[PDB]
Design a protein around this ligand. Structure first.
Ligand code: B12
Ligand code: B12
Ligand code: NA
Lengths: 252, 453, 453, 252
């Protein structure tokens, strides 16, 4: 009796007549990559294939999982929306994902503060689980350390169906000097909760290239932990404002 | 030229070469998204017809982004052998397709003919090729390069070991290396995409890779696939240099998007010749893929297949050790399903080989695309028969960090033993010394990373 | 046995072996139509896991139609070597899969093991194989038969010449034959589906086929693919006998749909031994394909892959020269698109080879299925790497008469020269005598039916 | 310049250094199979591939196209339906194409003559062109053939979305001794006019098998001519009612 989602199945070693089986256990302990499952001829072993297939069925489900907006409302967040209406239309039109709809400009101008030094934007992106697992652990201690010894922190909000180039339009509307965007990257096989931060100094839709952004990726419990990743963004926000330089233009 | 044909009584008129190139593509998601795709099956075939009647001069003298505005266009145009071009400029694209596919055309015939091409002409030939045309066409155009291994010899098949980790944990990287080597993976390169783009981290990952290389005297190359600027720094300040990597795009706007100048690529070649631990003459490594130019706003109304060919025109200038497309790396926006990803991979490989670069393929998909692991295994075998120079290897193909699925270590061993292909001759000799390979075949002791302990 | 597993905290319960077999299938439109498919990907994987834990005994002792009700079930059960069965009966299907794929399992090992299998156990193994598992597994299970040509030697690749015409016009039939032979097609058989099931017409078609065979002394076979009843009559009354054909189905009810008794196939074997112009010992020819039992109402709640395996259990009893599936012959109702048609083709071939029959494939599609000629070319090459014994040949693959698209004459030559495969050694000798082939390759004057004149 | 649909494109000989090009011309003339197109290596020549691809684009149109209800009314036919609503469902559900709908049984009992000797049914099937091109050429000489010299003729009607097994339900409801179905078989690559006749003696839904039918296939202008196919179906119906024998149950 074996669950393919269980911790016993994850740690399963399938190499048949090992040279050194104690080394195999430490190798499997070293990584979350699917090592040490052995082979049948040159093919995967059956259990490794089955666990692969199990994990892929879960991984498909995570891409079109969506946040409840009553989760978003009870985070204390403004929910705002891009041009896209569907999850199906998000997956197939990146261009509508990186500009806001007609009421989204209006809600942000009327309800959010104008000309902040640092502006925080949250999007579901390609993984809902990335922002929904990590939120309580990222957002308060980030939005501490910006206001807690800095200056004018902008009011945070949630973009639905966002691509990262939408933060160019957001930076222009609010007049924002640094725009930072926490967003769900594409789901992997084994894990859905990986968060990225994309960050421009003073973005402009007709000017800022992708290389002008600073990326910090792989934010979760199995990457850089969301507590201490909030510290490294606050530090980056300081370094950005000081040298007026965005991403590839940052020193050293 | 004719920009016009009639099909079944109906006149199909096209505005320019760029529209003909775009609409002659097999249906894909990204061409529809770019707005450049054919309206119907009938108009697709009409565009294929018009393209086939267009001459080599017709397409060479209409690049999709103009000479004066784009440094990639200039580079592709300046690289043309004009004597080779003058021989073929009045060939129709139909005649060039039949010339490439002909058994009476040798590898040495194509060696000269390809020097009279531009990337747009390469693209044009691929657009009127069926799937078996792309496979048989690519197979009779081998491209051979050498670092510390020789890649691309007919009857051989190589593999990048891609030992990626979420933290760049050097224990997790090493574990995946010992695993890949035990399947005979890593004759193309041992190549890590790092998490952090800084010099001491790059140096530590390179020390981890070359720790294994030096201990076991492996004939191969290391690479850390950060930005080319940080690699050069790392190597200048004393990290082991193997292959030097850059992601490229097929326009100046697209290069600007990636934060690359052409002069960095010249510097990489100069740093390689000064520093790098490479016995042969090739030491650069590019990665490409359909949709990157679209994503950047940098396609200028061209289709993704034409823009991807322009990558191979750019890469060719620098005579790299290896190039691969990363075929379904981005998602269903640009290539939607099994059929489209297979077709792209076959196109990309054919166009790479026709451009005369050492072309492999990351046979891969994403989890928000309509694809699975059986897609990877279909494509990897088709491309292997096309004489694809290399694929990736990861443990079951699960990247824990780039969030996609490529091909397994298993798959390279499968392909080699299915098709009776060998590794790189230098690396194969090492595998035989380790007792991992006999006669192109995994031994009993193979597939077991504790063999190295 | 367990009919039950837990996956991601959720219990997945199944009713019987038949349901486990059905839902473990990769998604296809026919399984959804039959009502038997999995509800989700998670239940599909759960069914795969339950299946993999079941023993050879579990699935042998639960055929999808019962012993006493079905003459095909009786056929398959009676044919079992019981001491071969007793060795493997307590193997899990997971263990049987790994045994098949193992490099330490030889052809001679599988030769005895497969005799302890039934069709349902063969199907069970196919259901837990990936695409590369099916291809590699089939490749290491060669099946060799002999008529006037030897088929299925590793390193060889054969082809049916299929010269069909709308009127059975004998000039049109001859023109397609001369075209096929000029590409090196016809070593499997020269085989016409006739318009009229009629002794005088069958004799005329066969006289036309064997007119060309006798003139040029071709080592090959003729066939006319009418009902086995009218073939036998034609041959008894003195038409030339080569291969004797019947379409088959994996249930008694399915055979009744086709108008076939088992005793007709006993008679075809007896008629062949008396009459047929065959040097070797194999002279029968079956065709199969997924969906036929569903269409008949004769699947009895079983999926189309298990039913198709039972075809091969039926076929094996009669030791035919060749069998092929006709993979996308019917349409989108049973297999909808490229992905499903490729997957079925690899399943069917693997199951054929595991059942120990001389398994080829008509790589084909219909015009109302979501499919084109690029799919035929994907599939033919994948199956060729799997050591598929033969495909069809028609002029560009256009059947003017059966209203579908198979593989071209071009495609057999392409496969052979891509993959370094030869024809049947007898037929290759003939092609070399005619100046059509040198060293496995089409010569300059090949591909030209004027050569015979 | 060349139309790929033209007769000149269809006649094209592509073999590049012929042994005997006068034989090549006699061979191209003797068949409508795509012979004599030559090769580039072991691959098809470009024009041969282009004309293949053009024919496929148009063959793909012929499957999904439907004859207007106006045309069926203009023939003087009863139109009746199977259980299928539309063309999309027809392609995936053969089980519902083998059953008359609820109003279909009633319309047939209302408006069709009871206990015919011969019953002629028409369906579009998988090719509308197969019945649209051939109808006026096959149906009058068939209807004359059966009654005029012969026996009791049932009233002709058209079934939308029919599969072949639906004639077992039709023969039961009408009490028919012989049911003749003329139906569009699946379209070929260069051809969509191909009609088949499926005829069964005295069918019974849970008894008759496919072998109990006689097929006469490939009725069109490039096959058996629709005029003289009408005579061969009448004769088949005469023999059927004589020996009371179905399909494989028939003699000779
Ligand atoms: C898909 C992808 C790409 C795509 C582009 C994105 C797309 N069109 O969807 C392609 C193939 C072009 C690509 C290229 C490169 N990428 Co990238 N990419 C990824 C990946 C796998 C997904 C990111 C994601 O899902 N974003 C969320 C979605 C919802 O946003 P999106 O709007 O759909 O995509 C935007 C961003 O992804 C952005 N982007 C993509 N890559 C990079 C890299 C940097 C430095 C920046 C600032 C932005 C950026 O471009 C898109 C805007 O149009 C991540 C891996 C990961 N763990 O996430 C790496 C990743 C972000 N990329 C990486 C790198 C280094 C590159 C390259 C610079 C490679 C190189 N060394 O030359 C190039 C150039 C990128 C550029 N400067 O424009 C690194 C970034 C390292 C860092 N912290 O600075 C990552 C983290 C992977 C790694 N190796 O660790 N990549
Ligand atoms: C597709 C096809 C099949 C499919 C059936 C499709 C399905 N199960 O859904 C399969 C692969 C099962 C098949 C099998 C056979 N077929 Co068939 N089939 C064809 C094809 C190509 C298309 C017919 C069509 O489109 N029907 C119209 C559609 C709209 O109706 P449908 O409800 O979707 O399908 C029904 C009919 O196709 C019918 N059917 C199919 N084949 C045959 C053969 C006969 C003799 C009969 C009475 C009925 C019949 O079965 C379906 C009812 O469930 C024709 C060739 C052509 N150009 O027409 C040959 C064709 C009709 N078949 C032929 C033959 C001989 C056979 C076999 C007897 C082969 C053999 N020699 O053993 C078997 C057994 C048939 C049976 N008794 O069940 C001959 C008929 C000769 C004749 N005039 O008697 C044809 C004309 C091809 C040829 N060789 O010339 N076939
Ligand atoms: Na020429």
């Amino acid at each position: 009796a074996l669950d393919l989602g269980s911790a016993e199945a994850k740690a399963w070693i399938g190499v048949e007549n090992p040279h050194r089986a104690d080394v195999l256990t430490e190798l499997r302990r070293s990584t979350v990559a699917r090592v040490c499952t052995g082979r049948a001829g040159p093919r995967p072993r059956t259990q490794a294939l089955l666990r692969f297939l199990a994990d892929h069925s879960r991984s498909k489900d995570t891409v079109l999982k969506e946040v409840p907006e009553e989760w978003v409302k009870a985070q204390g967040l403004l929910e705002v929306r891009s041009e896209i209406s569907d999850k199906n239309l998000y997956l197939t039109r990146p261009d509508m994902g990186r500009r806001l709809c007609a009421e989204a400009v209006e809600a942000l101008k009327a309800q959010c503060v104008a000309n902040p030094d640092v502006q925080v934007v949250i999007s579901d992106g390609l993984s809902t689980d990335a922002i929904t697992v990590n939120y309580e652990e990222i957002l308060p201690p980030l939005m501490a350390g910006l206001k807690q010894a800095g200056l004018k922190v902008g009011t945070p909000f949630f973009v639905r169906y966002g691509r990262v180039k939408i933060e160019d339009q957001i930076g222009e509307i609010l007049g924002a000097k640094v725009v930072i965007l926490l967003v769900g990257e594409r789901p992997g096989l084994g894990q859905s909760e990986s968060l990225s931060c994309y960050a421009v100094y003073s973005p402009r839709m007709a000017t800022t290239v992708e290389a002008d952004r600073t990326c910090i990726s792989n934010i979760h419990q199995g990457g850089t932990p969301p507590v201490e990743a909030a510290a490294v963004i606050v530090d980056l926000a300081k370094r950005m404002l000081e040298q007026k330089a965005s991403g590839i233009n940052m020193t050293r | 030229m004719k920009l016009k044909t009639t099909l079944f009584g109906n006149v199909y008129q096209f505005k320019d070469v760029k529209e003909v190139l775009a609409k002659a593509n097999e249906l894909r998601s990204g061409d529809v998204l770019a707005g450049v795709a054919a309206a119907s099956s009938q108009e697709r075939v009409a565009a294929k017809q018009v393209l086939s009647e267009m001459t080599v001069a017709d397409i060479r003298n209409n690049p999709v982004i103009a000479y004066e505005d784009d440094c990639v266009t200039r580079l592709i145009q300046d690289d043309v052998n004009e004597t080779a071009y003058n021989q073929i400029k009045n060939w129709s694209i139909s005649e060039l397709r039949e010339y490439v596919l002909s058994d009476e055309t040798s590898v040495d015939d194509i060696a000269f003919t390809r020097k009279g091409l531009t990337s747009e002409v390469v693209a044009a030939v691929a657009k009127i090729c069926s799937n078996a045309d792309l496979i048989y066409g690519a197979k009779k155009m081998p491209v051979i390069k050498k670092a510390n291994t020789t890649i691309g010899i007919p009857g051989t098949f190589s593999a990048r070991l891609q030992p990626n980790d979420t933290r760049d944990d050097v224990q997790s990287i090493a574990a995946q290396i010992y695993e890949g080597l035990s399947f005979g993976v890593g004759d193309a390169v041992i190549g890590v995409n790092p998490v952090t783009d800084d010099v001491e981290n790059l140096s530590r990952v390179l020390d981890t890779i070359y720790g294994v290389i030096d201990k076991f005297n492996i004939p191969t190359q290391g690479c850390v696939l950060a930005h080319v600027t940080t690699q050069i720094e790392a190597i200048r300040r004393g990290a082991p240099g193997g292959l030097i990597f850059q992601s490229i795009c097929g326009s100046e706007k697209g290069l600007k998007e990636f934060g690359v100048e052409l002069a960095m690529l010249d510097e990489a070649r100069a740093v390689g010749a000064e520093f790098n631990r490479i016995a042969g003459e090739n030491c650069l490594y590019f990665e490409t893929g359909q949709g990157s130019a679209l994503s950047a706003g940098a396609n200028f109304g061209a289709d993704q297949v034409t823009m991807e060919a322009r990558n191979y025109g750019l890469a060719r200038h620098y005579d790299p050790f290896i190039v691969n497309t990363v075929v379904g790396f981005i998602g269903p926006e640009y290539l939607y399903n099994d059929r489209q990803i297979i077709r792209a991979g076959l196109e990309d490989h054919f166009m790479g080989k026709l451009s005369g670069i050492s072309m492999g393929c990351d046979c891969c998909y994403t989890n928000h695309a309509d694809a699975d692991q059986n897609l990877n295994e279909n494509l990897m075998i088709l491309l292997a028969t096309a004489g694809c120079n290399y694929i990736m290897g990861m443990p079951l193909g699960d990247d824990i960090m780039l969030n996609y699925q490529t091909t397994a270590f298993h798959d390279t061993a499968t392909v080699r033993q299915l098709l009776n292909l060998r590794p790189s001759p230098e690396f194969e000799r090492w595998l035989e010394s380790m007792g991992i390979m006999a006669n192109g075949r995994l031994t009993k002791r193979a597939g077991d990373p504790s063999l190295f302990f």
